[PDB]
Amino acid sequence: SPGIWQLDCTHLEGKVILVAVHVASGYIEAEVIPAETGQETAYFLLKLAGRWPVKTVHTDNGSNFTSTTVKAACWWAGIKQEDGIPYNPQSQGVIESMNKELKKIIGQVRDQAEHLKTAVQMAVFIHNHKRKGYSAGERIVDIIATDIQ
Amino acid sequence: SPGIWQLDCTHLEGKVILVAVHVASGYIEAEVIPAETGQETAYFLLKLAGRWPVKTVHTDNGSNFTSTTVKAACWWAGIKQEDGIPYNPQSQGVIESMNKELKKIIGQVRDQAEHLKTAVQMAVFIHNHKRKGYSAGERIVDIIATDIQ
Ligand SMILES: CN(Cc1ccccc1C(=O)NCc1ccccc1)Cc1ccc2c(c1C(=O)O)OC[C@H](CCC(=O)O)O2
Numbered sequence: 001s002p003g004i005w006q007l008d009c010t011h012l013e014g015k016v017i018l019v020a021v022h023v024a025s026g027y028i029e030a031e032v033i034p035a036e037t038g039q040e041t042a043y044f045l046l047k048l049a050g051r052w053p054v055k056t057v058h059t060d061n062g063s064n065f066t067s068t069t070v071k072a073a074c075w076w077a078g079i080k081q082e083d084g085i086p087y088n089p090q091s092q093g094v095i096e097s098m099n100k101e102l103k104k105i106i107g108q109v110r111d112q113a114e115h116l117k118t119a120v121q122m123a124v125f126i127h128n129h130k131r132k133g134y135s136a137g138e139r140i141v142d143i144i145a146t147d148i149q
Numbered sequence: 150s151p152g153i154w155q156l157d158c159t160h161l162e163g164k165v166i167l168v169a170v171h172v173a174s175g176y177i178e179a180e181v182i183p184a185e186t187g188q189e190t191a192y193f194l195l196k197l198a199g200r201w202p203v204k205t206v207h208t209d210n211g212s213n214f215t216s217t218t219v220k221a222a223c224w225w226a227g228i229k230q231e232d233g234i235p236y237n238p239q240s241q242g243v244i245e246s247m248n249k250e251l252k253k254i255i256g257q258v259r260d261q262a263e264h265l266k267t268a269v270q271m272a273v274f275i276h277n278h279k280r281k282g283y284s285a286g287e288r289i290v291d292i293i294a295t296d297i298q
């Protein structure tokens with residue numbers, strides 16, 4: 001499970017926030033895109049996999065699962081592309097809670113930037129650094145390092 | 150040194166590739182931008198610092214050191230902004246070598262994408278996964294996890 005990630009798409013201000021969540025740690029990366037296309041999703045996964053050791057991605061919906069551009073990115077980056085069916089129903093609730101948390105943080109910073117993308121990156125920073133006591137950023141590094149060793 | 154990063158700007162195809170290098174590991178993040186501005190640099194640092202525990206950034210040039218937008222990003226993200234003067238002359242050679250390596254990789258993948266940004270992300274992936282035997286991606290995680298513990 002050190003290599004498992006989950007995609008998540010949420011909406012704000014008539015734009016799309018694409019999120020990848022490292023399941024085991026709750027660490028996230030995110031970007032603002034005008035719309036959630038296969039090409040946007042593919043590029044996002046390519047970035048993610050160059051930065052972290054991404055073994056498996058649970059796609060956020062059936063369109064991204066189906067997308068041959070997304071499949072091409074997963075092939076390129078050596079990622080196992082999987083569906084995102086919540087066989088464990090707790091997954092649904094976790095993601096919904098996360099989207100609510102992120103939107104709350106974006107609200108708290110929204111006046112510190114003109115553009116939504118800046119606010120989203122501020123929210124990523126706050127989420128990943130928040131101690132709950134370790135932070136998600138500490139947890140992901142410890143989980144992966146333990147795996148390497 | 151787990152928290153020390155160096156900025157680096159290189160050019161290709163009439164575009165700018167902005168790179169951050171984790172000094173102790175050689176791990177990199179990079180993006181393609183139309184031009185180096187304070188705003189682009191500030192946004193890049195904001196992204197980097199939300200993803201890794203960035204303590205100190207050696208700026209790539211004096212304009213980015215001076216830029217009040219870059220200083221504002223460093224303030225926001227809790228980064229110590231420093232100059233990039235190669236007091237150790239080996240620094241110069243390392244960054245030059247890295248730029249040549251990255252451009253080499255970009256050439257090797259260039260026909261696998263229409264857009265330069267895609268090729269740059271492929272190059273980031275290849276660089277960070279390359280075993281030198283550990284990869285830069287393994288070294289950065291080990292270095293940071295050892296720091297946390
Ligand atoms: C579609 N294209 C096809 C292609 C075109 C030419 C040669 C090979 C291929 C090919 O299939 N390569 C294999 C491959 C490797 C990795 C990932 C996917 C496929 C690749 C691609 C995907 C997402 C992008 C791209 C590009 C691009 O061509 O550069 O460009 C920027 C864009 C930014 C986000 C947005 O703007 O949506 O995301």
Ligand SMILES: CN(Cc1ccccc1C(=O)NCc1ccccc1)Cc1ccc2c(c1C(=O)O)OC[C@H](CCC(=O)O)O2
Binds near residue numbers: 112118192221222
């Ligand atoms: C310039 N602006 C000033 C500002 C405007 C309104 C309110 C507060 C501030 C303010 O000073 N906040 C403190 C602050 C926090 C964090 C970093 C820097 C400053 C902030 C900013 C920087 C880089 C960006 C932005 C933005 C934006 O406003 O959203 O937008 C996307 C753009 C993308 C890259 C490109 O397009 O160059 O990079």
Ligand SMILES: [Cl-]
Binds near residue numbers: 128137198199202
């Ligand atoms: Cl972090």
Ligand SMILES: [Cl-]
Binds near residue numbers: 049052278
């Ligand atoms: Cl990696």
